[PDB]
Amino acid sequence: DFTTFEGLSKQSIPHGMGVMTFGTGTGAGFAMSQTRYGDKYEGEFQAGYAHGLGQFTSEASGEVYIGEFFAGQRHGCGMTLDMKPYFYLLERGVDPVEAYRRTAGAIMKNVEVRTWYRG
Amino acid sequence: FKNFFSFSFLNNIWSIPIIIPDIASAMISEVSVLDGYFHNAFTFLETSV
Amino acid sequence: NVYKGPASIPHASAEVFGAFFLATNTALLAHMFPGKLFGSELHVRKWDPDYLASCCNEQGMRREALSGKKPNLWLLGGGPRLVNDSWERMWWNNLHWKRWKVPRTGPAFPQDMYWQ
Amino acid sequence: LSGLLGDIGVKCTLAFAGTVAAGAAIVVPSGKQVEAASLDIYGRPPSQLLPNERRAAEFAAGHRRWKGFVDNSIYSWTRTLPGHDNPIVNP
Amino acid sequence: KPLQRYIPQNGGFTWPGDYLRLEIVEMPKLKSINIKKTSLKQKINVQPV
Amino acid sequence: SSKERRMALEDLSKWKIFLLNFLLALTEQSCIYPFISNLSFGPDASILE
Amino acid sequence: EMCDIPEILGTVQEARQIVERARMWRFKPYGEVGLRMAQDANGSPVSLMQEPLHYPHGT
Ligand SMILES: CCCCCCCCCCCC
Ligand SMILES: CCCCCCCCCCCC
């Protein structure tokens, strides 16, 4: 399904640290509806699950999550950003400096800090 | 045998052009602006001496 | 004095067999111990094919760019196949060449010495 | 030279070449791809077809020719004689 | 028992897109015409869906 | 070499001697003492750069 | 028990370290992902500068 994984592995299962890019479908214990084509998870893996500390990035939607994961779901402290306007301006031919200058304040104001329990 | 005899193997392709994608089509998630003045899209003019 | 067969049919000497035997044994011994062959080792090749291809591509692209034309990259194995199903099939030749990187370069026998 | 024909390898190579030549004579189509195969299997002119589709059309035409030959020439001759008691494996 | 290892492997006997469609699997085929008394020579095993 | 053919050298023999080494220079041959035949008096990894 | 602001800040600070350390397994020189997912604008494969001995184009 073009889902790719690069990182440490025990036996044949992802184990340790690594980066996983999602294609069609899902992986690393994530729900089928959470991911899209091109999203990535970087951080700790354990028994094929995104378990530990990590960061989830979605280029299509702009959501960025940094923090704790248990099993395959968010569980612990986390920080959420919505960089959608920056990507929107970047994809429309605007140089990164100008897009950052335009959309830094709104993104900084909407930074969220949260505690998650079983997703 | 027809390909071997007709000299049609001289039309084989071995080379392709390389085109650099712009920042719009690149990994925009990797591009980040530092201090509001620089970014990570590195492009230097090959070798200048 | 003995017949030893007709002279029309070629005969192989014993020196060639002795040389073959000693050469095989010495090749195995030299492969086993990399650092003992007069302080040096035994190499199958001089330059890796990928290194030569990269150098040649670099020089060719430099020459083409300086001449005022868009450079081209020559692929080891062959070019693309005009197909509309899957990306792997389109670039099967270059992928086939690149997938043999480890077996082509590295030796099959263990690199170091064990039990001694 | 009869000396070449004396060797077994030359005879085997000649037999293989003759078999290949006969097969190509009896199965290679000509003008039946666009007429029958291409329009039937893709409904498009052979020129507009992808390179991997033209080969499929040619293979279909050749297979049709092979079946026609094996039915109209060999099987009619060998089946004019009816079932001659049809020996079967006893054990 | 020897442990199974889940490593994706590269194409063989077919292009990566498809699978072996014409593989022969031993399962009886049923004729639409009713057969009053004729053993299938191979039981269909688990009958219900 | 094993058959030990010895005779006065003609032009054809000399050209055979030339051609043997000329063709052998285009293949991968066993090399003793590496890391010394690959040295170069310059800021490079070999002499081909 | 809900995390407070210092705990969340420390968790993010450590998570960034973890992500940076994990991003070092991302572009294995000769691997399937690197060979099949590193493409130029037209989608053709590119020769990534990851040779152990060759540093071309004044790099
Ligand atoms: C092995 C079959 C192809 C060999 C071709 C060698 C020379 C290619 C020259 C191409 C010029 C356009
Ligand atoms: C050497 C064995 C094959 C030689 C004959 C080739 C048969 C196909 C020829 C087709 C010509 C139109």
Coordinates of C-alpha atoms and ligand atoms in Angstrom, one line a residue:
Chain A
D1 CA 0.0 0.0 0.0
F2 CA 3.1 2.2 -0.3
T3 CA 3.4 2.8 3.4
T4 CA 7.1 3.1 4.2
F5 CA 9.1 2.5 7.3
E6 CA 12.7 3.4 8.0
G7 CA 14.4 2.7 11.3
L8 CA 15.5 0.1 13.8
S9 CA 13.8 -3.2 13.9
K10 CA 13.9 -6.4 15.9
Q11 CA 13.3 -9.7 14.2
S12 CA 11.1 -8.3 11.4
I13 CA 8.9 -5.9 13.4
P14 CA 9.6 -2.2 13.8
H15 CA 11.2 -1.7 17.2
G16 CA 13.2 1.2 18.7
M17 CA 13.2 4.4 16.8
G18 CA 12.2 5.4 13.3
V19 CA 10.1 7.3 10.8
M20 CA 7.0 5.9 9.1
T21 CA 5.3 7.5 6.1
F22 CA 1.6 6.6 5.5
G23 CA 0.2 5.9 2.0
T24 CA -3.1 4.3 1.3
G25 CA -4.2 2.5 4.4
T26 CA -2.6 2.9 7.8
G27 CA 0.1 1.5 10.1
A28 CA 1.9 1.7 13.4
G29 CA -1.4 1.1 15.3
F30 CA -3.1 4.3 14.0
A31 CA -6.8 4.2 13.2
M32 CA -7.7 3.9 9.5
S33 CA -9.4 7.4 9.4
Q34 CA -6.6 9.3 11.1
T35 CA -4.0 9.2 8.4
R36 CA -3.8 10.4 4.8
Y37 CA -1.4 9.9 1.9
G38 CA 1.8 11.6 2.8
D39 CA 1.5 12.0 6.6
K40 CA 4.4 10.9 8.7
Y41 CA 5.2 9.9 12.3
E42 CA 8.7 10.3 13.7
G43 CA 9.8 8.9 17.0
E44 CA 9.8 5.8 19.2
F45 CA 8.3 2.5 18.1
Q46 CA 7.7 -0.6 20.1
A47 CA 6.3 -4.0 18.9
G48 CA 5.1 -2.2 15.7
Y49 CA 3.2 0.4 17.7
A50 CA 3.9 4.1 17.9
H51 CA 4.6 3.9 21.6
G52 CA 6.7 6.4 23.5
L53 CA 7.6 9.9 22.5
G54 CA 7.1 11.3 19.0
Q55 CA 5.7 13.8 16.5
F56 CA 2.9 13.3 14.0
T57 CA 2.9 15.6 10.9
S58 CA 0.2 15.9 8.3
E59 CA 1.2 17.8 5.2
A60 CA -2.3 17.6 3.7
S61 CA -4.2 19.0 6.7
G62 CA -1.4 20.9 8.5
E63 CA -2.0 19.4 12.0
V64 CA 1.3 18.9 13.9
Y65 CA 1.2 17.0 17.2
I66 CA 4.3 16.7 19.5
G67 CA 4.2 14.5 22.6
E68 CA 3.4 11.3 24.3
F69 CA 1.9 8.2 22.7
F70 CA 0.6 4.9 24.3
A71 CA -0.1 1.9 22.1
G72 CA -1.1 3.5 18.8
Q73 CA -3.1 6.5 20.2
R74 CA -2.4 9.8 21.9
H75 CA -2.1 9.2 25.7
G76 CA -0.3 11.7 27.9
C77 CA 0.8 15.3 27.5
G78 CA 0.8 16.8 24.0
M79 CA 1.1 20.0 22.0
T80 CA -0.9 20.8 18.9
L81 CA -0.2 23.3 16.1
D82 CA -2.2 24.1 13.0
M83 CA 0.2 25.3 10.3
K84 CA -2.4 25.0 7.5
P85 CA -2.2 28.7 6.3
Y86 CA 1.6 28.5 6.0
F87 CA 1.4 25.4 3.8
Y88 CA -1.5 27.0 1.9
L89 CA 0.6 30.1 1.1
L90 CA 3.7 27.9 0.4
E91 CA 1.8 25.8 -2.2
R92 CA 0.6 29.0 -4.1
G93 CA 4.1 30.2 -5.2
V94 CA 4.9 32.4 -2.1
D95 CA 8.5 32.2 -0.9
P96 CA 8.9 30.8 2.7
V97 CA 10.0 34.1 4.3
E98 CA 7.0 36.0 3.0
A99 CA 4.6 33.3 4.0
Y100 CA 6.1 33.1 7.5
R101 CA 5.9 36.8 7.9
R102 CA 2.2 36.8 6.8
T103 CA 1.1 33.8 8.9
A104 CA 3.4 33.6 11.9
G105 CA 1.2 35.4 14.4
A106 CA -2.0 33.6 13.8
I107 CA -0.3 30.2 14.0
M108 CA 1.5 31.2 17.2
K109 CA -1.7 32.4 18.8
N110 CA -3.5 29.1 18.1
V111 CA -1.0 26.9 19.8
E112 CA -2.7 24.3 22.0
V113 CA -1.5 22.4 25.0
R114 CA -3.5 19.4 26.1
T115 CA -3.7 16.2 28.1
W116 CA -5.0 13.2 26.2
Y117 CA -6.4 10.0 27.6
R118 CA -6.7 7.0 25.2
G119 CA -7.0 9.4 22.3
Chain B
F1 CA 16.0 -11.9 -33.8
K2 CA 14.3 -9.1 -35.7
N3 CA 15.5 -6.6 -33.1
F4 CA 19.0 -8.0 -33.3
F5 CA 19.1 -8.0 -37.1
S6 CA 17.3 -4.7 -37.9
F7 CA 19.7 -2.5 -35.9
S8 CA 16.6 -1.2 -34.0
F9 CA 18.6 -1.5 -30.7
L10 CA 20.3 1.8 -31.6
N11 CA 17.0 3.5 -30.6
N12 CA 17.4 2.4 -26.9
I13 CA 17.2 5.1 -24.2
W14 CA 19.9 5.4 -21.6
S15 CA 19.8 9.0 -20.5
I16 CA 17.1 11.1 -18.8
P17 CA 17.0 14.9 -17.9
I18 CA 17.0 15.9 -14.2
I19 CA 14.7 18.8 -13.3
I20 CA 14.7 20.4 -9.9
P21 CA 11.2 20.8 -8.4
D22 CA 10.2 24.1 -7.0
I23 CA 9.4 24.7 -3.4
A24 CA 5.6 24.4 -4.2
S25 CA 6.1 20.8 -5.3
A26 CA 8.8 19.9 -2.8
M27 CA 8.5 18.6 0.7
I28 CA 7.0 21.7 2.2
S29 CA 6.8 20.1 5.6
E30 CA 10.6 20.0 5.7
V31 CA 11.0 23.7 4.8
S32 CA 11.2 25.9 7.9
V33 CA 11.9 29.6 8.3
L34 CA 14.6 30.4 10.9
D35 CA 14.5 33.8 12.6
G36 CA 12.2 35.0 9.8
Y37 CA 15.2 35.6 7.5
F38 CA 16.4 32.2 6.3
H39 CA 15.1 28.8 5.2
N40 CA 16.3 25.2 4.7
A41 CA 15.9 25.1 0.9
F42 CA 19.6 24.8 0.0
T43 CA 20.7 25.7 -3.5
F44 CA 24.2 26.8 -4.2
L45 CA 25.6 27.5 -7.7
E46 CA 27.6 24.2 -8.0
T47 CA 31.3 25.1 -7.8
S48 CA 32.5 28.7 -7.9
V49 CA 36.2 29.4 -7.5
Chain C
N1 CA 57.9 -46.4 -22.7
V2 CA 54.2 -46.9 -22.0
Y3 CA 51.6 -46.1 -24.7
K4 CA 50.2 -43.0 -23.0
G5 CA 47.6 -42.7 -25.8
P6 CA 47.8 -41.3 -29.3
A7 CA 49.7 -38.1 -29.8
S8 CA 46.9 -36.5 -31.9
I9 CA 44.7 -36.1 -28.8
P10 CA 46.2 -33.3 -26.6
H11 CA 47.6 -34.1 -23.2
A12 CA 47.8 -31.9 -20.1
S13 CA 50.9 -31.9 -18.0
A14 CA 51.2 -32.3 -14.2
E15 CA 52.7 -28.9 -13.7
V16 CA 49.4 -27.2 -14.7
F17 CA 47.5 -29.4 -12.2
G18 CA 50.0 -28.6 -9.4
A19 CA 49.8 -24.9 -10.2
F20 CA 46.0 -25.0 -10.1
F21 CA 46.0 -26.9 -6.7
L22 CA 48.5 -24.5 -5.1
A23 CA 46.7 -21.4 -6.6
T24 CA 43.4 -22.5 -5.2
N25 CA 44.8 -23.2 -1.7
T26 CA 46.8 -19.9 -1.7
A27 CA 43.7 -18.0 -2.8
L28 CA 41.7 -19.5 0.0
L29 CA 44.4 -18.8 2.5
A30 CA 44.9 -15.2 1.3
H31 CA 41.1 -14.6 1.5
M32 CA 41.0 -16.0 5.1
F33 CA 43.7 -13.6 6.4
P34 CA 43.4 -10.1 4.9
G35 CA 46.4 -8.5 6.7
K36 CA 49.1 -11.2 6.5
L37 CA 49.9 -11.1 2.7
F38 CA 53.1 -9.2 3.1
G39 CA 51.2 -6.6 5.0
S40 CA 48.7 -6.3 2.2
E41 CA 45.5 -8.0 1.0
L42 CA 44.0 -9.4 -2.2
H43 CA 41.5 -7.4 -4.2
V44 CA 39.3 -8.7 -7.0
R45 CA 38.8 -5.4 -8.7
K46 CA 40.5 -2.0 -8.8
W47 CA 37.6 0.5 -8.9
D48 CA 33.9 -0.2 -8.1
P49 CA 31.7 0.1 -11.1
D50 CA 29.4 2.6 -9.3
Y51 CA 32.4 4.9 -8.6
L52 CA 33.4 4.9 -12.3
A53 CA 29.8 5.5 -13.4
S54 CA 29.4 8.4 -10.9
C55 CA 32.7 10.0 -12.0
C56 CA 31.9 9.7 -15.7
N57 CA 28.4 11.1 -15.2
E58 CA 29.8 14.0 -13.2
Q59 CA 32.3 14.8 -15.9
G60 CA 29.8 14.5 -18.7
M61 CA 27.2 16.7 -16.9
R62 CA 29.9 19.3 -16.2
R63 CA 30.9 19.3 -19.9
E64 CA 27.3 19.5 -21.1
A65 CA 26.4 22.3 -18.7
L66 CA 29.4 24.3 -19.7
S67 CA 28.5 23.9 -23.3
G68 CA 25.1 25.5 -22.8
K69 CA 22.7 22.5 -22.7
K70 CA 20.6 20.7 -20.1
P71 CA 22.7 17.8 -18.7
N72 CA 21.5 14.2 -18.9
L73 CA 22.1 11.3 -16.5
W74 CA 23.0 7.9 -18.0
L75 CA 21.5 5.0 -16.1
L76 CA 23.2 1.7 -15.4
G77 CA 21.0 -1.1 -16.7
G78 CA 18.8 0.8 -19.2
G79 CA 16.2 3.5 -19.5
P80 CA 12.5 3.6 -18.7
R81 CA 9.7 1.5 -20.2
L82 CA 6.6 3.3 -21.4
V83 CA 3.9 1.7 -19.2
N84 CA 0.9 3.1 -17.3
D85 CA 0.7 0.5 -14.5
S86 CA 3.0 0.9 -11.4
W87 CA 6.2 2.9 -11.0
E88 CA 8.5 -0.1 -10.4
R89 CA 7.8 -1.6 -13.8
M90 CA 8.6 1.7 -15.6
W91 CA 12.1 1.8 -14.0
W92 CA 12.7 -1.9 -13.7
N93 CA 16.2 -2.0 -15.3
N94 CA 17.8 0.6 -13.1
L95 CA 16.1 -0.8 -10.0
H96 CA 17.3 -4.3 -10.9
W97 CA 20.9 -3.0 -11.3
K98 CA 20.7 -1.1 -8.0
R99 CA 19.2 -3.9 -6.0
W100 CA 22.4 -6.0 -6.4
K101 CA 24.6 -3.4 -4.7
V102 CA 25.6 -5.5 -1.6
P103 CA 26.3 -8.8 -3.4
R104 CA 28.2 -7.1 -6.2
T105 CA 30.7 -5.3 -3.9
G106 CA 31.0 -7.2 -0.6
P107 CA 32.6 -10.6 -0.3
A108 CA 30.6 -13.7 0.5
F109 CA 33.1 -15.1 3.0
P110 CA 33.4 -13.6 6.5
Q111 CA 35.6 -10.5 6.4
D112 CA 37.4 -11.1 9.7
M113 CA 38.9 -14.3 11.3
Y114 CA 37.2 -16.4 14.0
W115 CA 38.7 -19.2 16.2
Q116 CA 42.1 -17.7 15.6
Chain D
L1 CA 29.5 -30.1 -46.3
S2 CA 28.5 -33.6 -45.2
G3 CA 31.1 -33.4 -42.4
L4 CA 29.1 -30.8 -40.6
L5 CA 25.9 -32.9 -41.0
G6 CA 27.8 -35.8 -39.5
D7 CA 28.0 -34.3 -36.1
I8 CA 25.0 -34.7 -33.7
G9 CA 25.0 -31.1 -32.5
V10 CA 24.6 -29.6 -36.0
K11 CA 21.7 -32.0 -36.7
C12 CA 20.0 -31.0 -33.4
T13 CA 20.5 -27.3 -34.2
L14 CA 19.1 -27.7 -37.7
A15 CA 16.1 -29.6 -36.3
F16 CA 15.5 -26.9 -33.8
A17 CA 15.8 -24.2 -36.5
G18 CA 13.4 -26.1 -38.8
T19 CA 10.8 -26.5 -36.0
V20 CA 11.1 -22.7 -35.2
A21 CA 10.7 -21.9 -38.9
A22 CA 7.6 -24.1 -39.3
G23 CA 6.1 -22.6 -36.1
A24 CA 6.6 -19.1 -37.4
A25 CA 5.2 -20.0 -40.8
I26 CA 2.0 -21.5 -39.3
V27 CA 1.3 -19.1 -36.3
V28 CA 2.6 -15.6 -37.4
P29 CA -0.4 -13.4 -38.2
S30 CA -0.5 -10.7 -40.8
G31 CA -3.2 -8.0 -41.0
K32 CA -5.5 -9.9 -38.6
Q33 CA -4.5 -7.9 -35.5
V34 CA -6.3 -4.7 -36.4
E35 CA -9.0 -6.6 -38.4
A36 CA -9.9 -9.1 -35.6
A37 CA -7.7 -9.1 -32.5
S38 CA -7.2 -5.4 -31.7
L39 CA -10.8 -4.2 -32.2
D40 CA -12.2 -7.2 -30.3
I41 CA -9.9 -7.0 -27.2
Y42 CA -9.4 -3.3 -27.0
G43 CA -11.8 -1.6 -29.5
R44 CA -9.0 0.8 -30.6
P45 CA -6.7 1.0 -33.6
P46 CA -3.4 -0.9 -33.1
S47 CA -1.3 2.3 -33.6
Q48 CA -3.0 4.1 -30.6
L49 CA -2.4 1.0 -28.4
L50 CA 0.3 1.0 -25.8
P51 CA 3.4 -1.1 -26.8
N52 CA 2.4 -3.8 -24.3
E53 CA -1.1 -4.1 -25.8
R54 CA -0.1 -4.6 -29.4
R55 CA 1.9 -7.6 -28.3
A56 CA -1.2 -9.0 -26.6
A57 CA -3.3 -8.5 -29.8
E58 CA -0.6 -10.2 -31.9
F59 CA -0.5 -13.1 -29.4
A60 CA -4.3 -13.4 -29.6
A61 CA -4.2 -13.5 -33.4
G62 CA -1.4 -16.1 -33.4
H63 CA -3.2 -18.3 -30.8
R64 CA -6.4 -18.1 -32.9
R65 CA -4.4 -19.2 -36.0
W66 CA -2.7 -22.0 -34.1
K67 CA -6.1 -23.4 -32.9
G68 CA -7.6 -23.1 -36.3
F69 CA -4.6 -25.0 -37.8
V70 CA -4.7 -27.7 -35.2
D71 CA -8.5 -28.2 -35.6
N72 CA -8.8 -28.0 -39.4
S73 CA -5.7 -30.0 -40.4
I74 CA -4.5 -32.4 -37.7
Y75 CA -7.6 -33.2 -35.6
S76 CA -9.9 -33.7 -38.5
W77 CA -7.4 -36.2 -40.0
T78 CA -6.8 -38.0 -36.7
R79 CA -10.5 -38.0 -35.7
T80 CA -11.9 -39.3 -39.0
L81 CA -11.1 -42.6 -37.3
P82 CA -13.7 -42.9 -34.4
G83 CA -12.8 -43.8 -30.8
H84 CA -10.9 -47.1 -31.2
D85 CA -12.1 -48.6 -27.9
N86 CA -10.1 -45.9 -26.0
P87 CA -7.6 -47.9 -24.0
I88 CA -7.5 -46.8 -20.3
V89 CA -5.2 -47.4 -17.4
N90 CA -6.2 -50.7 -15.8
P91 CA -4.6 -50.2 -12.4
Chain E
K1 CA 7.5 -23.5 15.7
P2 CA 9.8 -21.5 13.4
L3 CA 8.9 -17.8 13.6
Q4 CA 7.2 -16.1 10.6
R5 CA 8.9 -12.8 9.5
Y6 CA 6.8 -10.1 7.8
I7 CA 9.2 -8.6 5.3
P8 CA 7.8 -7.4 1.9
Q9 CA 9.4 -9.1 -1.0
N10 CA 9.9 -8.1 -4.6
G11 CA 8.1 -9.3 -7.7
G12 CA 8.3 -12.8 -9.2
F13 CA 6.5 -14.5 -12.1
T14 CA 4.2 -11.4 -12.3
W15 CA 4.4 -7.6 -12.3
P16 CA 3.9 -6.1 -8.8
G17 CA 0.3 -5.0 -9.4
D18 CA -1.3 -8.4 -9.9
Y19 CA -1.4 -11.8 -8.4
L20 CA -1.7 -15.4 -9.8
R21 CA -5.3 -15.4 -11.0
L22 CA -5.1 -18.7 -12.9
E23 CA -3.7 -20.8 -10.1
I24 CA -5.5 -24.2 -9.7
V25 CA -7.2 -24.8 -6.4
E26 CA -8.9 -28.1 -5.6
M27 CA -12.5 -27.2 -5.0
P28 CA -15.4 -28.8 -6.9
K29 CA -17.4 -26.8 -9.5
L30 CA -21.2 -27.3 -9.6
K31 CA -23.2 -27.7 -12.8
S32 CA -26.5 -25.9 -13.1
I33 CA -28.2 -29.0 -14.5
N34 CA -29.5 -31.1 -11.6
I35 CA -27.7 -34.4 -10.9
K36 CA -30.0 -36.7 -9.0
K37 CA -27.4 -39.2 -7.7
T38 CA -23.7 -38.4 -8.5
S39 CA -20.9 -38.1 -5.9
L40 CA -18.7 -35.1 -6.4
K41 CA -15.6 -37.2 -5.7
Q42 CA -14.6 -34.3 -3.4
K43 CA -16.8 -33.1 -0.5
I44 CA -17.4 -29.4 -0.3
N45 CA -16.6 -29.6 3.4
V46 CA -18.0 -26.6 5.4
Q47 CA -21.3 -26.1 3.6
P48 CA -22.8 -23.0 5.2
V49 CA -21.5 -19.5 4.6
Chain F
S1 CA 52.5 -20.5 -21.8
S2 CA 52.2 -24.1 -20.5
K3 CA 52.9 -25.5 -24.0
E4 CA 56.1 -23.4 -24.1
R5 CA 56.1 -22.2 -27.7
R6 CA 59.4 -20.6 -28.6
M7 CA 60.4 -19.1 -31.9
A8 CA 61.7 -15.9 -33.5
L9 CA 59.1 -13.1 -33.0
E10 CA 57.2 -11.9 -36.1
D11 CA 54.9 -8.9 -36.5
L12 CA 51.8 -11.0 -35.9
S13 CA 53.2 -12.4 -32.7
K14 CA 54.0 -8.9 -31.4
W15 CA 50.5 -7.7 -32.3
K16 CA 49.0 -10.7 -30.5
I17 CA 51.1 -9.8 -27.4
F18 CA 49.9 -6.1 -27.7
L19 CA 46.3 -7.1 -28.1
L20 CA 46.3 -9.5 -25.2
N21 CA 47.3 -6.8 -22.7
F22 CA 45.1 -4.2 -24.5
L23 CA 42.0 -6.4 -24.0
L24 CA 43.1 -7.4 -20.4
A25 CA 43.3 -3.7 -19.5
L26 CA 39.5 -3.4 -20.0
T27 CA 38.5 -6.1 -17.5
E28 CA 38.5 -6.3 -13.7
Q29 CA 41.7 -8.1 -12.6
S30 CA 43.0 -9.2 -9.3
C31 CA 45.2 -6.5 -7.6
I32 CA 47.7 -6.9 -4.8
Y33 CA 48.8 -4.0 -2.6
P34 CA 45.6 -1.8 -2.7
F35 CA 45.5 1.6 -1.1
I36 CA 48.8 2.3 -2.7
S37 CA 48.0 1.9 -6.4
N38 CA 45.0 4.1 -5.7
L39 CA 46.9 7.0 -4.2
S40 CA 47.2 10.4 -5.9
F41 CA 49.2 13.5 -5.2
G42 CA 46.1 15.7 -4.9
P43 CA 43.0 16.5 -2.8
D44 CA 41.1 13.6 -4.4
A45 CA 40.3 10.0 -3.7
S46 CA 41.8 8.6 -7.0
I47 CA 43.4 9.8 -10.2
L48 CA 40.1 9.6 -12.2
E49 CA 38.5 12.7 -10.6
Chain G
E1 CA -4.1 14.1 36.6
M2 CA -3.8 16.8 33.9
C3 CA -0.4 18.1 32.9
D4 CA 0.6 21.6 33.9
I5 CA 2.4 24.0 31.6
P6 CA 6.0 23.3 32.8
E7 CA 5.4 19.5 32.4
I8 CA 4.0 20.0 28.8
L9 CA 7.0 22.2 28.0
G10 CA 9.4 19.6 29.3
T11 CA 7.6 16.9 27.4
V12 CA 7.8 18.8 24.1
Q13 CA 11.5 19.6 24.8
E14 CA 12.3 15.9 25.2
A15 CA 10.1 14.9 22.3
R16 CA 12.0 17.2 20.0
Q17 CA 15.2 15.5 21.1
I18 CA 13.7 12.1 20.5
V19 CA 12.5 13.1 17.0
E20 CA 15.9 14.6 16.1
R21 CA 17.6 11.4 17.2
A22 CA 15.1 9.2 15.3
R23 CA 15.4 11.2 12.1
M24 CA 18.8 9.7 11.5
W25 CA 17.5 6.5 10.0
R26 CA 15.6 8.3 7.2
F27 CA 17.7 8.0 4.1
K28 CA 19.6 4.7 4.2
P29 CA 22.0 4.8 1.2
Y30 CA 20.8 1.8 -0.8
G31 CA 17.3 0.9 0.4
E32 CA 13.9 0.4 -1.1
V33 CA 12.4 3.6 0.2
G34 CA 15.4 5.6 -0.9
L35 CA 15.5 4.0 -4.4
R36 CA 11.8 4.2 -5.0
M37 CA 10.7 7.5 -3.3
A38 CA 13.5 10.0 -4.0
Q39 CA 12.3 11.6 -7.3
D40 CA 12.7 14.8 -9.2
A41 CA 9.9 17.1 -10.5
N42 CA 9.1 14.7 -13.3
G43 CA 9.1 11.7 -11.0
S44 CA 12.2 10.1 -12.5
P45 CA 14.8 8.7 -10.0
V46 CA 17.7 10.8 -8.9
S47 CA 21.3 9.8 -8.0
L48 CA 21.5 10.9 -4.4
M49 CA 25.0 12.0 -3.3
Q50 CA 25.5 9.1 -0.8
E51 CA 28.6 7.4 -2.3
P52 CA 31.1 6.5 0.4
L53 CA 34.0 7.5 -1.7
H54 CA 32.8 10.1 -4.3
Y55 CA 32.0 13.7 -3.5
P56 CA 31.1 15.3 -6.9
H57 CA 30.4 18.8 -8.2
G58 CA 32.7 20.6 -5.7
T59 CA 31.0 19.2 -2.6
Ligands
LIG1 C1 23.3 -3.5 -25.7 C2 22.4 -2.9 -26.7 C3 22.6 -1.4 -26.9 C4 24.0 -1.0 -27.2 C5 24.2 0.5 -27.7 C6 25.6 1.0 -27.5 C7 25.8 2.4 -28.1 C8 24.6 3.4 -27.8 C9 24.7 4.7 -28.6 C10 23.4 5.5 -28.5 C11 23.5 6.7 -29.4 C12 22.1 7.4 -29.4
LIG2 C1 18.5 -19.1 -35.9 C2 17.1 -19.6 -35.8 C3 16.0 -18.7 -36.3 C4 16.2 -18.2 -37.7 C5 15.0 -18.0 -38.5 C6 14.0 -16.9 -38.0 C7 12.6 -17.2 -38.2 C8 11.7 -16.0 -38.3 C9 11.9 -15.1 -39.5 C10 10.8 -14.2 -39.8 C11 11.0 -13.4 -41.1 C12 9.7 -12.6 -41.5

